[PDB]
Amino acid sequence: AQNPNCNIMIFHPTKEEFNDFDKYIAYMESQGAHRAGLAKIIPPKEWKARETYDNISEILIATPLQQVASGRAGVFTQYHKKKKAMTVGEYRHLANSKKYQTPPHQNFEDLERKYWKNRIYNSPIYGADISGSLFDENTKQWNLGHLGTIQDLLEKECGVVIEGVNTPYLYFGMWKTTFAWHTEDMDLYSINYLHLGEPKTWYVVPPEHGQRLERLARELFPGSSRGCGAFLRHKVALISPTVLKENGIPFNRITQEAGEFMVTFPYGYHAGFNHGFNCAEAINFATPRWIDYGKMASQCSCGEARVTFSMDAFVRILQPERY
Amino acid sequence: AQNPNCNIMIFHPTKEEFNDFDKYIAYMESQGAHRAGLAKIIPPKEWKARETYDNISEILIATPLQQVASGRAGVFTQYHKKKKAMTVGEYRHLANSKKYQTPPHQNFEDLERKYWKNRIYNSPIYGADISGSLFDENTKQWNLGHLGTIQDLLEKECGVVIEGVNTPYLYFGMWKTTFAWHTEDMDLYSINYLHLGEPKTWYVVPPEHGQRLERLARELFPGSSRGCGAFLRHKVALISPTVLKENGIPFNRITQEAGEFMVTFPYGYHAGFNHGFNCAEAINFATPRWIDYGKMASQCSCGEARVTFSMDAFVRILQPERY
Ligand SMILES: Cc1ccccc1S(N)(=O)=O
Numbered sequence: 001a002q003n004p005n006c007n008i009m010i011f012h013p014t015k016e017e018f019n020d021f022d023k024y025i026a027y028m029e030s031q032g033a034h035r036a037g038l039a040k041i042i043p044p045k046e047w048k049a050r051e052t053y054d055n056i057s058e059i060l061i062a063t064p065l066q067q068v069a070s071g072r073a074g075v076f077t078q079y080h081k082k083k084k085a086m087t088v089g090e091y092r093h094l095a096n097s098k099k100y101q102t103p104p105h106q107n108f109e110d111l112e113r114k115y116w117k118n119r120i121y122n123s124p125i126y127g128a129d130i131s132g133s134l135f136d137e138n139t140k141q142w143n144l145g146h147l148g149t150i151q152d153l154l155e156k157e158c159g160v161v162i163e164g165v166n167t168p169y170l171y172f173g174m175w176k177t178t179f180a181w182h183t184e185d186m187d188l189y190s191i192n193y194l195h196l197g198e199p200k201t202w203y204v205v206p207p208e209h210g211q212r213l214e215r216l217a218r219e220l221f222p223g224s225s226r227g228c229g230a231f232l233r234h235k236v237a238l239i240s241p242t243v244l245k246e247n248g249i250p251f252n253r254i255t256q257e258a259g260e261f262m263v264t265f266p267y268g269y270h271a272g273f274n275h276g277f278n279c280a281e282a283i284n285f286a287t288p289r290w291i292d293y294g295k296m297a298s299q300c301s302c303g304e305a306r307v308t309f310s311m312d313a314f315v316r317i318l319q320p321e322r323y
Numbered sequence: 324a325q326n327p328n329c330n331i332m333i334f335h336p337t338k339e340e341f342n343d344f345d346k347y348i349a350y351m352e353s354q355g356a357h358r359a360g361l362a363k364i365i366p367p368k369e370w371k372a373r374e375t376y377d378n379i380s381e382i383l384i385a386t387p388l389q390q391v392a393s394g395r396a397g398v399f400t401q402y403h404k405k406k407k408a409m410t411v412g413e414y415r416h417l418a419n420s421k422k423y424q425t426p427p428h429q430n431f432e433d434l435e436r437k438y439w440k441n442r443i444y445n446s447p448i449y450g451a452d453i454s455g456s457l458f459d460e461n462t463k464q465w466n467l468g469h470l471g472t473i474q475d476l477l478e479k480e481c482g483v484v485i486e487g488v489n490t491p492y493l494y495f496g497m498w499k500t501t502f503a504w505h506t507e508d509m510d511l512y513s514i515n516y517l518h519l520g521e522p523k524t525w526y527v528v529p530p531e532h533g534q535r536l537e538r539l540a541r542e543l544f545p546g547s548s549r550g551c552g553a554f555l556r557h558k559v560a561l562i563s564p565t566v567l568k569e570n571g572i573p574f575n576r577i578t579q580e581a582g583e584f585m586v587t588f589p590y591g592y593h594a595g596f597n598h599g600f601n602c603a604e605a606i607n608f609a610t611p612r613w614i615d616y617g618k619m620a621s622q623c624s625c626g627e628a629r630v631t632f633s634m635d636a637f638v639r640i641l642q643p644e645r646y
Pocket residue numbers: 008009010011
């Protein structure tokens with residue numbers, strides 16, 4: 001079996017290899033990439049997402065989210081307090097202000113130490129889940145707004161036609177902005193391109209060990225666990241790498257820089273944080289191997305987790321009992 | 324000037340001409356097609372939207388709308404009463420039931436007579452505005468889910484990058500289901516493909532005469548007009564061809580059949596009805612010529628008209644005062 005220790009793999013496709021998205025995902029999996037839950041793809045040097053990022057300041061963040069923490073430094077939840085609308089230009093200025101800017105630090109490791117030591121004592125503002133794309137329409141390869149849809153994948157694999165659409169989201173981040181431990185809706189894949197700015201650090205649990213993280217989460221967030229059988233779907237819980245090591249949870253970490261893609265694989269739990277002002281674009285996608293994971297995916301039914309309209313059809317066809 | 328009487332033109336592109344969407348729209352306008360407000364495009368015989376429509380019965384209509392009329396036979400409003408969810412298979416069966424099925428009739432003209440005589444005395448159920456597509460992903464030409472986005476058009480023309488996305492909608496219709504007099508959001512173009520089933524009859528006012536229809540509508544719906552300076556944006560008002568002729572409003576009519584595209588042009592008011600069970604797919608799009616119309620488009624501010632999240636950026640950039 002390939003990649004038995006479930007390490008995060010890094011790929012450097014040639015421009016020829018970069019012409020067929022589906023084929024390259026399948027290639028990565030033939031090398032065992034999916035066992036980690038996360039892979040990095042560095043695009044060929046000839047490729048570009050767009051010409052420049054010079055005219056993006058007028059994009060609106062209609063509902064910036066202030067991420068307020070509760071708990072202890074290595075085990076906490078965050079809730080999202082809605083703030084008034086601001087443009088990306090205004091958001092960038094805020095990110096770079098004395099109150100919110102990245103502190104002096106020696107390297108990625110020093111910054112990681114500072115994040116887990118001090119995250120809970122601040123409430124950074126995140127521009128998340130903004131429907132849109134920054135890929136040039138003329139960018140024909142790995143354009144996250146031009147991928148085959150999950151609805152068409154399900155139709156190709158299972159022969160059923162369903163309603164729903166599948167479009168990218170933009171994420172504007174600043175120092176300490178955080179994504180909580182989660183898998184994707186319906187345990188789909190995701191792909192994430194860091195367009196511009198400071199890095200994003202990722203933590204990931206191998207899909208074959210996801211239930212170990214779930215069991216620890218139930219122990220560490222007992223009230224939340226009693227409230228919902230799938231509360232990690234709420235996307236509010238954080239657990240530090242030190243606490244993961246203390247509890248024997250297998251995981252890996254890697255830092256994504258501007259110009260790089262990350263792919264998360266079905267049922268690969270991930271979490272992380274931004275180093276400073278940045279902009280990422282992400283979308284869910286599927287492959288034939290996803291179907292079995294979609295059939296088995298946990299669901300939140302307590303009402304907290306937001307459901308997209310497109311998720312309805314997934315549950316209806318793949319999980320009719322639970323529907 | 325081409326097409327000075329503002330007639331609806333019908334186009335028969337060759338398979339070679341069908342390879343460049345933007346170029347063919349520009350060609351149609353060079354022949355004066357836009358002056359009518361509406362054009363028909365019959366695709367080349369070699370083209371197909373998808374292989375078959377055999378497996379569409381499991382699509383869900385989450386919120387079927389019962390279209391209840393008030394007023395007189397030739398001048399009425401309709402409101403949409405929400406019904407419980409049903410599949411397309413269930414909807415088709417309902418459409419074909421004795422209560423809702425198309426009556427015996429001699430031709431399109433006889434059916435049109437019956438529609439305007441009797442529409443208000445029934446309340447047909449419409450499956451409208453369902454996000455999704457029935458184009459095969461392998462259909463590369465005139466695939467309504469693969470068009471250049473309006474956001475990218477605005478960026479190409481004006482140099483500003485904005486948030487927002489632009490995806491198709493499905494419409495499942497039955498006898499007497501009705502679309503009220505309207506122009507598109509931000510006076511955009513629309514394109515509509517009739518995938519399957521019975522015809523759709525369209526009425527259209529030339530864009531250069533749109534204000535004539537507005538003035539008549541203010542006279543015929545006086546309470547609505549007092550409530551909102553752009554109440555046709557509510558998409559609830561119907562006026563018959565007989566009443567249009569009585570009031571000297573220039574208009575044309577045409578019937579769309581399965582396998583045919585219709586394009587509506589900026590500020591071309593249109594209305595119409597379905598002949599029996601059918602399924603259409605539609606999406607808005609833009610061209611360089613649209614920008615001037617978008618800048619001038621009326622807006623509903625009374626709160627009735629539904630606004631998509633994507634419309635925000637259009638108003639913000641093209642109409643900053645009104646924003
Ligand atoms: C093969 C190689 C080489 C250097 C770094 C990483 C890899 S990989 N693709 O992560 O196994």
